[PDB]
């Protein structure tokens, strides 16, 4: 929402009665991708259901689901069984923040959000490890204390069943329970400096052989926005990752224009090097069109890995 | 909707404010199929979500999703992951019609609608190629100007990633992008002769090695409906297709009765020859029952025993 | 679902006009399972849609869908295509009860509901064969006539297409239609004894080489509840199954406390032996938390005998 143009918007209230509400939201987002003059339909629908029940003025319960649905006809009127259950959680919140269990966001998304401002492109050099991103078996916390926003998460290792040598098997055939070692945590903080338009952010995450930190800053004036983000860590034992993003935005009437630069290195070789620009027209707050171009600055990476991309989108938010 | 009894009904408005509306629709449709005395559960649920944002009095935006959900227990309380994302589109519309991108109908369904009036059977001799039917990677247009309805669609070929010999592979193993050559288009027009009861329609489509035209006409007056449909084309290199449908319908009170004859030939051999009849009772606009029988006129001189079998269907349909 | 805590609650009316209504229901149910100190995310969402069209005072139609959605990331932000279409039916009801076709409950769940009162655990020694449980290609009936509740179902065998030697093949290759022999039926009765707080229940089912009956009784009085359930039958040719279950419940304010003993024997070997206890707190009718512990008394693999702690938070849509 807002400057994070690709993010979900709040849904429509379909039931409300007695501090209890049901909001149905999501989107129908038509997306045409053009690479080497060849089209791919990257359209997606999301459907989401957010229930909130006020328990008292200090406390509320929440439930949330979101699914994403796509097609891949390849030229036939095919049956398309493409579903991703993006979110499945319940939680409790109040004046001291909100805590959930189930698949939900970890702490670093609101840091990557400093530079993730484009309708389609961008966010290519800010890889989030699972516990920092969105993942199940996870306790997720968010709170806002004046000008300070904090998020945190803690993921449990997933239970599995193993034989007497440690091979993973069906429970019926197992000798004992073990786990996959995929416990982890994430933490972030954002400080908004009053009404100045200046925000800073930082965070960290760790999960088995993966770890990272992030630093960001942004400055918002009346119709202009600037931001930078830095990520550094390991994606595996002896696989370094470092990424940098810059973002700029300008708003003119109902239109928003953005540009980003994204550069990442994986194992000390460049893995992303993108300059992208876009334009997004808001007819209404829930109906928009956009056009975006990614200059892919990798070159002879493979031919396919170095191709530029044009994207054209029409987005309706439920 | 309406005379196209198997089609969706408009949904229920659940939200309407600030120039935005949300309609939730779909169906829960219980369907027992009996062939050679043997029962198959053909029940299906649809759920759909239609969003409309009024921009000004001659402009609006739309978003639409429809999913179909079924079971196939085969005698066990099974876990059933059966989903078909039937429609996923967004569009912009207004005085000059509506255009969408994403999986949506092409132009010929409104032509097949002339004879596709039964609750379960019919529509067996009017095959639509993908771009004419419903398919993704497609821009789809529809407009109604007085008594003239027009539709058009254009589908792009799908990009793929290939190796040095053109075999489709993952993007990491690929030498280059290519495409599948599945571009195409469709077009149609329907003229409704105001209150006379007469309608005429035609259309055309073309996609890769397939093409077809359709012609149709109908008469509706005072609870009676008659129609005919002709389709002719090619479904592949060296595979002609010609189909004929006739339809008649009668509405009495809350009941609707229909009959269709459908005859198709594929590569100059009869591939469908069906006479079907049905009765549908509308308890309420969104709750109905029906019974239907298809007399399959194919026989052992032209088709296998299974391909030649008749079908009884019994349904109960609730529309959300 | 009242005392049957793990069951669905009625949904929220999003549309209502002229005796036609649409309810959107379901849950978002966060569930952490801990065994031998190791955690599993058993969280689930349900989404459901119930349409009802009053036709007259004594007649209505219904349509229902429910899906269940889960994740299994295993430590990655995975794409999760996990969907179970639990219910897909339409029906007609009124004075003489309600009849449906499409995937819906058979007759025995209202009997297992005598002791299936826990938030998470319980219902481990009351196996229901498909026709008695929930399955498609089935006609389902329910009706209440004063203090007598009845349910019944009949399942057709599923048609298939076979070659000339009986092997299942695709229709285009087939010689004839056949079926898989999965026809079956179920029946059950519950009698409420007037104003006494006592109910008794019985039912039975049969489907191919599986059959069973169940007997149950319950007492409900003044924030307390007790019940028993017995199940006996066959899960396959020469494969016996016997189960029993005891349950107790106590309600104090917004809190409900339950305990169950469940013991089942499959082919004359103990296959479930569980004592569970829990506590559920209803903050609001549609938001609850719970905690539950299952003492697994089997000691036969180490894994098969492990206890479980569950913690839940449940939002009902
Ligand atoms: C990043 C750390 C931000 C610290 C903010 C300090 C604000 O102090 C204001 C003093 O009162 C006015
Ligand atoms: C209310 C005035 C806030 C401005 C703070 C600017 C912070 C720059 O130093 C960042 C470290
Ligand atoms: C609309 C129904 C018209 C029926 C024509 C039937 C042609 C051959 O059918 C066999 C009876
Ligand atoms: C007016 O009288 C009734 C007309 O007949 C229509 C009956 O159609 C439905 C038959 O299937 C019923 C399944 O419950
Ligand atoms: C909506 C579907 C309702 C189905 C009604 C069931 C009556 C069908 O009985 C068929 C018996 O088949 C014998 C072989
Ligand atoms: C409070 C009475 C408990 C009775 C438990 C009986 C256990 C029998 O197990 C048979 C082996």
Curated annotation (Swiss-Prot), chain A:
Pfam families: Porin_4 (PF13609). Disulfide bonds: none annotated. GO terms for molecular function: porin activity. Its main location: membrane. Keywords: Cell outer membrane, Ion transport, Membrane, Porin, Signal, Transmembrane, Transmembrane beta strand, Transport. Gene3D superfamilies: Porin. Transmembrane segments: none annotated. GO terms for cellular component: cell outer membrane; pore complex. Forms pores that allow passive diffusion of small molecules across the outer membrane. PANTHER family: OUTER MEMBRANE PORIN F-RELATED (PTHR34501:SF2), PROTEIN YDDL-RELATED (PTHR34501). Belongs to the Gram-negative porin family. This is Outer membrane protein U. It comes from Vibrio cholerae serotype O1 (strain ATCC 39541 / Classical Ogawa 395 / O395). The gene is ompU.
Swiss-Prot record, chain B:
GO terms for cellular component: cell outer membrane; pore complex. The keyword Ubl conjugation does not apply. Gene3D superfamilies: Porin (2.40.160.10). InterPro entries: Gram-neg_bact_OMP, Gram_neg_porin_domain, Porin_dom_sf. Pfam families: Porin_4. It is found in: Cell outer membrane. GO terms for molecular function: porin activity. GO terms for biological process: monoatomic ion transport. The keyword Acetylation does not apply. Its main location: membrane. It is a multi-pass membrane protein. Keywords: Cell outer membrane, Ion transport, Membrane, Porin, Signal, Transmembrane, Transmembrane beta strand, Transport. Homotrimer. Belongs to the Gram-negative porin family. Forms pores that allow passive diffusion of small molecules across the outer membrane. This is Outer membrane protein U.
